[PDB]
Design an enzyme around this catalytic site. Structure first.
Site, PDB file in Angstrom:
ATOM      1  N   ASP A 187      30.854  -3.646 -28.603  1.00  0.00           N
ATOM      2  CA  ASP A 187      30.217  -4.856 -29.084  1.00  0.00           C
ATOM      3  C   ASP A 187      31.238  -5.974 -29.207  1.00  0.00           C
ATOM      4  O   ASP A 187      32.394  -5.745 -29.592  1.00  0.00           O
ATOM      5  CB  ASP A 187      29.555  -4.571 -30.432  1.00  0.00           C
ATOM      6  CG  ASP A 187      28.614  -5.669 -30.851  1.00  0.00           C
ATOM      7  OD1 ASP A 187      28.388  -6.618 -30.069  1.00  0.00           O
ATOM      8  OD2 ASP A 187      28.087  -5.558 -31.958  1.00  0.00           O
TER       9      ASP A 187
ATOM     10  N   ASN B 145      19.464  -6.378 -24.421  1.00  0.00           N
ATOM     11  CA  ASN B 145      20.351  -7.387 -23.864  1.00  0.00           C
ATOM     12  C   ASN B 145      20.237  -7.509 -22.348  1.00  0.00           C
ATOM     13  O   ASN B 145      21.078  -8.169 -21.729  1.00  0.00           O
ATOM     14  CB  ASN B 145      21.803  -7.104 -24.256  1.00  0.00           C
ATOM     15  CG  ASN B 145      22.133  -7.579 -25.671  1.00  0.00           C
ATOM     16  OD1 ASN B 145      21.806  -8.706 -26.052  1.00  0.00           O
ATOM     17  ND2 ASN B 145      22.798  -6.721 -26.449  1.00  0.00           N
TER      18      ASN B 145
END
Lengths: 214, 214
Positions: A15, A63
């Site tokens: 991340d 995403n």
């Protein structure tokens, strides 16, 4: 071989690439190229420690919200070339890869497929992965087979992955976001402040020491 | 009503009663009596903040490993009597309660059942709960009904519980241990060092501030 005290399977949620790119003025593809270099660092540090199963979550299904996804997949495939050439890691893909653009997906599959003899490590790379979809796949799997907890586990889309002992998530985000809900149920959860493209050996050491000290 | 910025649903894993009992020289039942008083504190602090859904994990299935479980269930039922008398919380039980001894289980059910008109809060109390069993129940549920992710969710044993915004686990344990795997997928995860019978208003404040600051 393994060191008693170390985690047997480490899962890392990669991340922070978008935030890193914005903070450095770079493209998203450039952040994922750097992120792939950090995956290469990570597996090197794991081999020194005898950690032989590593799962990295590179791309969520959420995403996926096209040209960008393609460039990101291609930077990831290229950046894994050194791991592949090492022969030390069998790279496997997990996630709903049929959701990705077909040519970049094939190039990523092509890198992974060339590592089928890699040994002793296993590196699972999750792309277009979602934990609720993983669980839902265990239902579709049992249906097509014609119920115990071990039968749900066997039909997970990620049934080839064993329990995760340590999860690391970067960027300071204190969430699992549905990463391998079944296998991480009893994992130690470690949150690293650094953004993934900046992940350091100190970050790795702090994470491992936190596991060993539990 | 709710305050924007606060979590809508807080889940707390009530960990540390056994360690607290050993450190204080007390019985396990005495630690769960104190732990129930902390649940009463917790829901009071939540009402001040307008937090109207609270789930607490009191007993795992794994920790059913008889006379002790009975005393623990009974100390919990008694210690929830003030919450029940307040009228501010509808108490509901979750978990495989048929696994518990029948008389203590009925007394806990009897306390909860008397709060059906409690309002505006909902307090879910998980006993003999396991996350992998929760997921497995969604399979048995779909089977008896005769598949989308929303259909798995609808048939969870905990289908009456909405998404959890903030999980707090006490005792310094940095693990979810399978607490509501579906609903906590995107929860903020906060780890409190204190043992559950010693959980303080400062601990509550630090947890809420961590959520608001994310």
């Amino acid at each position: 071989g393994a060191h008693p005290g170390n985690p047997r399977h480490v899962g890392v949620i990669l991340d922070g690439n978008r935030r890193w790119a914005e903070g450095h003025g770079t493209t998203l593809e450039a952040a994922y190229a750097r992120g792939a270099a950090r995956v290469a660092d990570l597996v090197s540090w794991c081999e020194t420690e005898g950690i032989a199963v590593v799962t990295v979550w590179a791309l969520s299904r959420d995403n996926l919200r096209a040209a960008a996804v393609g460039r990101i997949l291609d930077a990831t495939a290229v950046g894994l070339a050194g791991i592949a050439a090492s022969g030390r890691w069998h790279i496997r893909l997990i996630g709903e890869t049929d959701l990705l653009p077909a040519a970049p997906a094939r190039r990523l599959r092509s890198v992974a497929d060339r590592t089928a003899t890699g040994s002793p490590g296993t590196l699972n790379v999750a792309v277009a992965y979602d934990g609720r979809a993983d669980i839902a796949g265990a239902v579709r799997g049992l249906l097509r087979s014609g119920v115990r907890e071990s039968d749900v586990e066997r039909y997970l889309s990620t049934a080839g992955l064993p329990d995760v002992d340590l999860v690391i998530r970067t960027s300071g985000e204190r969430r699992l976001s549905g990463f391998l809900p079944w296998q991480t149920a009893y994992a130690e959860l470690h949150f690293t402040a650094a953004l993934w493209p900046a992940f350091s050996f100190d970050d790795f050491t702090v994470a491992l020491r936190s596991y060993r000290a539990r």
